[PDB]
């Protein structure tokens, strides 16, 4: 009953590399992930496939 109802969204860094041409757009889209997972405010449990990437 604790972990039901939770809407769990996974980050994809392999999707986060998309759309980066000039030097510095991967971390553009990464801190945009910090923007929307900042406003999401607890709704999303994260799973990091290969944690030791982080």
């Amino acid at each position: 009953e604790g972990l039901k109802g939770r809407r769990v969204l996974a980050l994809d860094m392999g999707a986060l590399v998309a759309g980066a041409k000039y030097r510095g757009e991967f971390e553009e889209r990464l801190k945009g992930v910090l923007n929307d997972l900042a406003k999401q405010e607890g709704n999303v449990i994260l799973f990091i496939d290969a944690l030791h990437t982080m």
């Binding site: 041409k21 000039y22 030097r23 510095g24």
Partner: protein, 104 residues
Amino acid sequence: LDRLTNKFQLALADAQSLALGHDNQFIEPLHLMSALLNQEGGSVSPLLTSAGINAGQLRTDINQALNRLPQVQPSQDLVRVLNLCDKLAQKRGDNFISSELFVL
């Protein structure tokens, strides 16, 4: 130089970072225009918008031009443009050299 407003100096420091980040040999007027158009609170984008110029499309075209520069510290082009800013400031009687003048 202390002749520039703080905002202008801040964009120039950013222009240097853009040049470094692109592995460019010099800081060209293009780097400075990009930094000015990218400065929050800056007067360059609104100035352009007030004249009917699409600032967003300009930003894109400037970044594209920056991406074309050779990859490998002000260029003479930039020194020259800044010298004109200085003269335009003098004609207007401006205490310091502001960002808007760089556009002209």
